[PDB]
Design a binder for this molecule. Sequence first.
Ligand SMILES: *Cc1c(COP(=O)(O)O)cnc(C)c1O
Ligand SMILES: *Cc1c(COP(=O)(O)O)cnc(C)c1O
Lengths: 382, 382
Amino acid sequence: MRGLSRRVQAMKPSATVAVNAKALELRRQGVDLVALTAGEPDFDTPEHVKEAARRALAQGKTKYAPPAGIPELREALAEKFRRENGLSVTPEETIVTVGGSQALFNLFQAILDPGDEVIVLSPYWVSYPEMVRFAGGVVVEVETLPEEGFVPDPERVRRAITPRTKALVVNSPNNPTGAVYPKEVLEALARLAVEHDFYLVSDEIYEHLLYEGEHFSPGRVAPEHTLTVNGAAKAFAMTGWRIGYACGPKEVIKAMASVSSQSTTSPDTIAQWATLEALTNQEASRAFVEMAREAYRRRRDLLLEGLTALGLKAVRPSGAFYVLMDTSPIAPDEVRAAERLLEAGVAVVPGTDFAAFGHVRLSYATSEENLRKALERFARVL
Amino acid sequence: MRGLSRRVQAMKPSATVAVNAKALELRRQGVDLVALTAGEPDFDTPEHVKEAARRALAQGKTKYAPPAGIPELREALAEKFRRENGLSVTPEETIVTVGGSQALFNLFQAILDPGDEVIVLSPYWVSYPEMVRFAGGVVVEVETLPEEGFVPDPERVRRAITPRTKALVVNSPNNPTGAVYPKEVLEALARLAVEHDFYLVSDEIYEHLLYEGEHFSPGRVAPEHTLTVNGAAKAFAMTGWRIGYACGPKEVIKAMASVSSQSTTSPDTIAQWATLEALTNQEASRAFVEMAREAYRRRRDLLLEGLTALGLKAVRPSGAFYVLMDTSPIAPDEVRAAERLLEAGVAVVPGTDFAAFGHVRLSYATSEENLRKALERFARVL
Ligand SMILES: *Cc1c(COP(=O)(O)O)cnc(C)c1O
Ligand SMILES: *Cc1c(COP(=O)(O)O)cnc(C)c1O
């Protein structure tokens, strides 16, 4: 018999896609749009990393690599996690994946049985519920509030814990809120995992995109319960290279490697060698990170000042490059609001898919010139 | 609760790993071993491919690409499948993946529900039964005989069909046997798919490594029932770039792309542009393929002659770069024969994991000198 499987037919339709279609038809008819939808840095990948790629090519490093990644990179990862994050991990507790997205995918496939529950904090990155459901898991949502700066309340999270809880996903700095969680909150969440016996999944890919505060890794207090996900995508403008990495409990890391061996085999060899350089040449990478950080901060300040002048509400973010704007004064709901802005000449992402109802996500990974234009168009709508 | 999923724990041990452990121990204690274990070309990837990669780097093509692959590549794939395989496909019925292995992985996740049966023809590539069982499928084995040149009998396959049969996997040229199936057998297998309503999965990655006969794609006779898997890995010596592709029913291709968006997002962008060059620059690419076919042919003949003179049995291969050798005159089983050969100074792959019992896989993807050096060491195990 023919026909698709139940797991693939169950995939929910994105609201972001429908808005995006209307954006394309407008472009076709000559309409000038300013896009504030980018989920990746506007800067190109730094030359020290590109150069390392060129060397690998000439050195003929074009053969299959081990499922968990070339050993040199696994060693550099153990160094990065300890030095930058205060995490006590060995090279064997590290893994290279096809982007941080595959680390999360392999992780869920490795720890979830049909029926297992995963607590997610809304607004959340679109992929979390999809991944949990594709592995037969049950999504249990806990909401963070705008009035609380979108920082989780440990008390609201405890109420979502049941005998079936397998994991808790935390993402700080956060996409789409841009919130940075204080160390006290993160320690409180780690404590819940220890007491209730479940995994704490910490998505930290935005660690270097920080404007105020400190990036705390919960793996510092509960290493055997925490699975730290990270990658080179957002920090070094390497989204198209597809290189991510994680660390955590030996048996879980080993399980994730077995999944890669039956699916992707191993990440692109040239990209693994280029990433080793990004981690080893701290001087050149630090220079790129500081340059991007100062640029994003100027862009963020400019945006918030403008939004405030227009009377538009948006919680001030401390990390990443996003801003959740309240659309109440523009329309009754975020989808209708996003369509109105398109007609005004500004492309935004509706908050529907992130569970950020009544809000729209704005990205400041664009030039200041583009941010000023958008603010002008916002004024016209009001 | 903490712990691993059943799907990850269901994966059983490999005989290849166990013998490779002793092989690494001997290499460690100053032992010289000739390796005939390679599953990838010994040639480095051609310069024009490397050159397309450098251009992409210099042009800033390092951003996220669409889930099914960049539009330029999907269009080139349609042409390749039409021109080389006589398949009538559109760019929309085409998909780019992270290696041919991911194409197969996403396929089974998209079409298999727990209990659905898949028919594999033994000896088979180690990954087939792994991917089927991971998706909840049930493996049904149909044996191919050495006396029949490892070519399948449609009648034997027919007897294996039940109401629960979801797919049939065909691999020609074959790994590990090296057999090339005749157009008539492929047509017969395709018709069983249409007659009994199920999917025919055709793994054609070795299509260009053919010494005698013609390559036939069963998709020509059963388009609505056939998923054709291929890739740049073996033909253009690009195993480390991780780029594969497939074509087939529009709705299946669409479901495979959704699995990608939730896991790997999209294959490495630099590698996608490089692959486009390997498909469009026909003159440079054919020159490489022809040069490789010539070399593989010389090595094959050299190997078979040496085996025959030694009094060892082996079915003459028509494609790929493998040879299954009968280990009866050496040891009771293939694992012990593999261990005796190691001590004689030769590393080979036991046939256990491919279900090729009493046989050992030899790879001639190395220099003639190494092949000669290996045959010479074979005298010590008679
Ligand atoms: C970008 C991102 C990731 C991973 O991205 P990759 O491109 O797959 O490395 C994971 N989590 C969040 C919240 C992200 O924004
Ligand atoms: C090498 C191979 C593949 C795919 O390899 P990728 O490196 O993932 O492109 C598929 N089938 C067989 C039989 C192979 O030998």
